[PDB]
Amino acid sequence: MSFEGKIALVTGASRGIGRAIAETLVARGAKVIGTATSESGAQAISDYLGANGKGLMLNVTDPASIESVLENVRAEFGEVDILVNNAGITRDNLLMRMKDDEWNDIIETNLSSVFRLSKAVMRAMMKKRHGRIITIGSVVGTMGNAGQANYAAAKAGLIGFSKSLAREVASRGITVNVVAPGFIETDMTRALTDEQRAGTLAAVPAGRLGTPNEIASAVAFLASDEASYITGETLHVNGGMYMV
Amino acid sequence: MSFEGKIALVTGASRGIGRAIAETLVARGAKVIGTATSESGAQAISDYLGANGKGLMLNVTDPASIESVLENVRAEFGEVDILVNNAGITRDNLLMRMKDDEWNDIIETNLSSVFRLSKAVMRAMMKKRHGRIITIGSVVGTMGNAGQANYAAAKAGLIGFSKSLAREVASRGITVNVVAPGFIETDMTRALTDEQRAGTLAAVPAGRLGTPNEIASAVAFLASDEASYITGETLHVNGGMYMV
Amino acid sequence: MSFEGKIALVTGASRGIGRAIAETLVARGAKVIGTATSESGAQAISDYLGANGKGLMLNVTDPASIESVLENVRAEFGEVDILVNNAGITRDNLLMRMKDDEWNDIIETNLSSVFRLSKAVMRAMMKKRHGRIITIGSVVGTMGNAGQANYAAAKAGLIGFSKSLAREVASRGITVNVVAPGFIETDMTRALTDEQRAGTLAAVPAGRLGTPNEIASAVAFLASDEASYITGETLHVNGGMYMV
Amino acid sequence: MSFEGKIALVTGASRGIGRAIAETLVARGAKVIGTATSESGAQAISDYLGANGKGLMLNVTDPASIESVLENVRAEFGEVDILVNNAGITRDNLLMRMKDDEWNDIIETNLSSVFRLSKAVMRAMMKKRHGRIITIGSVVGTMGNAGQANYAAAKAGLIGFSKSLAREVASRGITVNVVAPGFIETDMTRALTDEQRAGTLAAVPAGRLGTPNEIASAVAFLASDEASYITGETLHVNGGMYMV
Numbered sequence: 001m002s003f004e005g006k007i008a009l010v011t012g013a014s015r016g017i018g019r020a021i022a023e024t025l026v027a028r029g030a031k032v033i034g035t036a037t038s039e040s041g042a043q044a045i046s047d048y049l050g051a052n053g054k055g056l057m058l059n060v061t062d063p064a065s066i067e068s069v070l071e072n073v074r075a076e077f078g079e080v081d082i083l084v085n086n087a088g089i090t091r092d093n094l095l096m097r098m099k100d101d102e103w104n105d106i107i108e109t110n111l112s113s114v115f116r117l118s119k120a121v122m123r124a125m126m127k128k129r130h131g132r133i134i135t136i137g138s139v140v141g142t143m144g145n146a147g148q149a150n151y152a153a154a155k156a157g158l159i160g161f162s163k164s165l166a167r168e169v170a171s172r173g174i175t176v177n178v179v180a181p182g183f184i185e186t187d188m189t190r191a192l193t194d195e196q197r198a199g200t201l202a203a204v205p206a207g208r209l210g211t212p213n214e215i216a217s218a219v220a221f222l223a224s225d226e227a228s229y230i231t232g233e234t235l236h237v238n239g240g241m242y243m244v
Numbered sequence: 245m246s247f248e249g250k251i252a253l254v255t256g257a258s259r260g261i262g263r264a265i266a267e268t269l270v271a272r273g274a275k276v277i278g279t280a281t282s283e284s285g286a287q288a289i290s291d292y293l294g295a296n297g298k299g300l301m302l303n304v305t306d307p308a309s310i311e312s313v314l315e316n317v318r319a320e321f322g323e324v325d326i327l328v329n330n331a332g333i334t335r336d337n338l339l340m341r342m343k344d345d346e347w348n349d350i351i352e353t354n355l356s357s358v359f360r361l362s363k364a365v366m367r368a369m370m371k372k373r374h375g376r377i378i379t380i381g382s383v384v385g386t387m388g389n390a391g392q393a394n395y396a397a398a399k400a401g402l403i404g405f406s407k408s409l410a411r412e413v414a415s416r417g418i419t420v421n422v423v424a425p426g427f428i429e430t431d432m433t434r435a436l437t438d439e440q441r442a443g444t445l446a447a448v449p450a451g452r453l454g455t456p457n458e459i460a461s462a463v464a465f466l467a468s469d470e471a472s473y474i475t476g477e478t479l480h481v482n483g484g485m486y487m488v
Numbered sequence: 489m490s491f492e493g494k495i496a497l498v499t500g501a502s503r504g505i506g507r508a509i510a511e512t513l514v515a516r517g518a519k520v521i522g523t524a525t526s527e528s529g530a531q532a533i534s535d536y537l538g539a540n541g542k543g544l545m546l547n548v549t550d551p552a553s554i555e556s557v558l559e560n561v562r563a564e565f566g567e568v569d570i571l572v573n574n575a576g577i578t579r580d581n582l583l584m585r586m587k588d589d590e591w592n593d594i595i596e597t598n599l600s601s602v603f604r605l606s607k608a609v610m611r612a613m614m615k616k617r618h619g620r621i622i623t624i625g626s627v628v629g630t631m632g633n634a635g636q637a638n639y640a641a642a643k644a645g646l647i648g649f650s651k652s653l654a655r656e657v658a659s660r661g662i663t664v665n666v667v668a669p670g671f672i673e674t675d676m677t678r679a680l681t682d683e684q685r686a687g688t689l690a691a692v693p694a695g696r697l698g699t700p701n702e703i704a705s706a707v708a709f710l711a712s713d714e715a716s717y718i719t720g721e722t723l724h725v726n727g728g729m730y731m732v
Numbered sequence: 733m734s735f736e737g738k739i740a741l742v743t744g745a746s747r748g749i750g751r752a753i754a755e756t757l758v759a760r761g762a763k764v765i766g767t768a769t770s771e772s773g774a775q776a777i778s779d780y781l782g783a784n785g786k787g788l789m790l791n792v793t794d795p796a797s798i799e800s801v802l803e804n805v806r807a808e809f810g811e812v813d814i815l816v817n818n819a820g821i822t823r824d825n826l827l828m829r830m831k832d833d834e835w836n837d838i839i840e841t842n843l844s845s846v847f848r849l850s851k852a853v854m855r856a857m858m859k860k861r862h863g864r865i866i867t868i869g870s871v872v873g874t875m876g877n878a879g880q881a882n883y884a885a886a887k888a889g890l891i892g893f894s895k896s897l898a899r900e901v902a903s904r905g906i907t908v909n910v911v912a913p914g915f916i917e918t919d920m921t922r923a924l925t926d927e928q929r930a931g932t933l934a935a936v937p938a939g940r941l942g943t944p945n946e947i948a949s950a951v952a953f954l955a956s957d958e959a960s961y962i963t964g965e966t967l968h969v970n971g972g973m974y975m976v
């Protein structure tokens with residue numbers, strides 16, 4: 001089992017991709033700490049993890065929340081070996097309608113969060129001479145998308161951040177990578193009309209949406225000892241929607 | 245190739261790249277408004293622009309400063325046709341030494357500024373069905389660089405922003421593009437040791453530093469009517485240091 | 489911006505993009521040699537070039553034809569300063585239907601031709617310590633396209649070739665670059681059904697086809713003294729169809 | 733075990749990366765057919781594979797050799813499920829010294845081979861509604877390298893080819909991907925002076941060469957059912973030497 005003895009922190013693990021990531025790391029031997037933004041969300045994460053981890057309330061924009069969560073992780077489980085930055089929001093609008101706080105909230109939540117959490121786990125990874133940081137990107141970070149300039153900025157920015165951090169820590173056995181999903185099936189997409197789905201599918205050579213478990217498999221590959229020579233990279237998981 | 249009757253605003257036009265951009269747009273017939281962060285800096289810009297423009301004090305992190313500058317431009321010259329986002333700062337540090345405000349100030353000054361300024365000029369461009377937005381990026385935005393994770397995040401971010409904005413306004417005759425310099429002769433590079441220079445030149449096939457005027461030429465090409473089918477693109481001007 | 493005293497060779501200059509390139513270089517002061525695959529095609533090129541150049545018959549797959557054309561150019565005009573590799577063909581088919589000669593002919597005509605022509609002009613450029621090589625790529629080289637695996641291979645290949653050549657000759661004042669058009673109005677596109685056009689326009693933010701002159705403007709920029717710090721680069725001119 | 737019941741064909745499996753790929757696929761349940769260019773090389777492959785596969789003599793430039801090898805595979809094992817295109821050569825020279833046959837041999841061996849072998853296995857993959865094609869690229873295909881314009885052309889070209897093929901076959905459950913190694917330890921590199929090594933290591937943030945087994949792990953990930961939503965992609969395995 002790949003992750004026996006490892007402690008993973010997966011931000012935004014309530015559902016969909018973040019839950020599939022948490023469950024996959026559990027299935028391969030890790031102890032997982034999954035986060036949500038509320039105390040009930042955190043309890044629902046504890047309920048699915050059971051004996052293989054815990055749910056905690058974390059707001060990745062608030063440094064006091066980050067510090068409190070990591071202290072709790074350290075007391076109960078130990079140091080973080082694997083950080084998976086999945087927490088992310090969208091607040092879409094065309095530029096002229098985009099409010100200052102819609103811009104700021106996305107930049108804080110989706111880009112500056114990657115800085116804060118990576119900084120907060122890095123020292124203990126450097127001491128172990130081994131670490132994994134994986135952030136969940138988006139195809140929109142590379143292509144752009146009308147009405148999502150805030151989101152695209154954050155998702156492109158976290159790649160620049162990750163490349164620079166990778167260059168600093170590569171020689172100490174820590175890799176820093178991004179997984180960029182395409183269109184993935186969630187509750188959201190399951191609620192759409194057949195016509196809304198058909199237009200999304202038309203953009204995907206594979207002819208289907210991706211599944212959360214497909215993103216989890218890519219994360220788990222990069223987090224494993226079989227990916228120790230991959231750093232500063234973006235792994236695109238999108239059914240051929242965008243080929244780099 | 246002529247800009248007669250066009251109004252350009254070039255942020256951070258005191259020296260180096262921003263000055264060369266301002267002078268080059270003048271040489272092609274534009275009226276140019278260059279900015280600096282102090283009243284004396286703005287006056288030095290007015291001195292070199294003379295009859296073909298003026299200098300103004302602008303803080304690109306302050307919406308009140310942006311609006312005051314644009315209202316002055318609108319009263320004296322008219323609406324901005326060409327926006328060149330050149331203003332930017334660096335606060336280098338390895339991640340472990342990087343203070344929260346060194347992150348925040350770079351994100352605000354180098355990325356969020358591009359959103360605020362673009363938003364502030366866009367309506368008048370959309371009415372005319374013609375416009376240019378050009379932002380000065382960096383090779384670091386695409387490659388990453390140790391000790392500049394903040395700067396790389398902002399410079400990568402501004403590309404994602406620019407692709408998204410490009411997609412929103414392409415059908416109204418507005419293009420949005422990035423020019424990414426390599427190592428350019430500037431106060432910054434003149435202040436390096438001979439050894440820091442030599443090592444950076446070894447990574448440049450051309451075997452020399454670029455000039456500010458070389459960046460200005462690329463900007464002036466993209467700002468022209470001869471580049472109306474180029475949008476959402478990044479023009480790398482780096483002597484082969486990085487080939488995309 | 490002027491090419492007075494420069495000699496340019498533009499392969500495949502009968503019509504469309506190659507003609508627009510030839511005419512634009514004339515308009516900027518160059519003497520232009522345009523090529524076609526027949527003696528009547530070459531004469532039609534001579535008719536439009538008049539006093540500012542000539543047409544010649546060239547087969548870019550035949551080294552004897554290349555050498556005969558260059559010797560004619562050298563006798564009448566002088567050494568080539570600017571090479572524009574525009575010659576190219578398509579032989580579309582899904583992989584299972586693609587005949588061996590449909591693969592081979594595209595590779596020979598669209599990729600190996602760029603090697604032979606570049607090699608044939610390079611020595612005189614190196615002696616002068618000044619030169620331009622510009623090859624016309626395609627968006628398909630970066631994105632791929634079903635039914636054009638041969639064409640995509642050649643157009644992607646020529647970029648790898650161009651980056652390698654750029655690295656060899658950058659320090660001698662020669663740049664080597666690619667211009668990658670999107671969907672441009674040409675005989676090809678005029679011969680499509682209204683439905684094939686409409687579907688391709690839906691993928692273009694600009695909402696229109698590009699013109700040959702738009703490609704020519706980008707080529708003329710790169711061929712100029714104002715682009716001496718741009719090498720190994722790909723300039724995408726596609727109305728936002730693909731944003732790198 | 734991931735590959736139980738699968739037949740993999742790994743071209744160029746004598747040593748280094750191709751051998752590590754063959755051995756890794758064996759270790760995960762596949763029957764492997766590994767190739768070499770001589771009858772003794774093929775026998776040495778049979779010796780290491782033992783009961784889990786066979787060695788055969790294959791020249792990927794010769795269609796009669798391709799057909800004979802695939803007929804042998806089909807009679808003894810069955811249809812190919814996984815094709816790994818590892819066969820590759822270099823014949824380096826600066827452009828002016830590069831002979832026509834040095835160009836042609838690399839294009840035939842490293843690019844056209846990918847077309848021929850992919851075409852030869854595709855029909856049976858389409859019938860199974862499941863398939864993997866993985867080609868071994870190189871960082872040089874994306875960066876370029878002086879003295880390797882032939883190699884860079886071929887390695888860039890095979891990405892264009894792979895993207896186009898992926899677009900044709902994505903909806904039938906076949907993925908087509910590239911693994912791009914950086915600097916990998918081989919017999920060659922083990923024979924170098926400490927000074928030659930030191931210069932190579934200086935370009936690699938990880939501070940070490942990659943191992944053949946690291947490339948094999950990436951191949952095996954893409955060949956598995958855990959990578960069914962990854963197609964048309966390039967996975968860079970280079971210790972941060974090049975970050976895309």
Ligand SMILES: NC(=O)c1ccc[n+]([C@@H]2O[C@H](COP(=O)([O-])OP(=O)(O)OC[C@H]3O[C@@H](n4cnc5c(N)ncnc54)[C@H](OP(=O)(O)O)[C@@H]3O)[C@@H](O)[C@H]2O)c1
Nearest residue numbers: 012013014036037038058059060086087088138181183184
């Ligand atoms: N779905 C797709 O097709 C797709 C495609 C590409 C990329 N992505 C990326 O995948 C990730 C998952 O998002 P999603 O839309 O798929 O599903 P989601 O269920 O909305 O997940 C978002 C998660 O982020 C957490 N979160 C939000 N704001 C936060 C904050 N301030 N602090 C900490 N956690 C916060 C949420 O917490 P609660 O549990 O408390 O709400 C939730 O767990 C995001 O990074 C997204 O950008 C998704």
Ligand SMILES: NC(=O)c1ccc[n+]([C@@H]2O[C@H](COP(=O)([O-])OP(=O)(O)OC[C@H]3O[C@@H](n4cnc5c(N)ncnc54)[C@H](OP(=O)(O)O)[C@@H]3O)[C@@H](O)[C@H]2O)c1
Nearest residue numbers: 744745746768769770790791792818819820870913915916
């Ligand atoms: N080593 C690195 O650092 C590195 C880096 C990036 C990419 N690569 C790529 O990895 C692959 C392995 O090459 P290598 O240099 O690492 O080791 P290598 O041991 O030289 O492998 C090359 C293999 O290709 C086979 N081959 C050569 N010409 C052939 C032909 N005409 N038909 C069929 N097979 C042929 C050889 O056969 P024989 O066994 O009969 O000689 C040999 O098995 C190549 O695609 C290479 O471009 C390697």
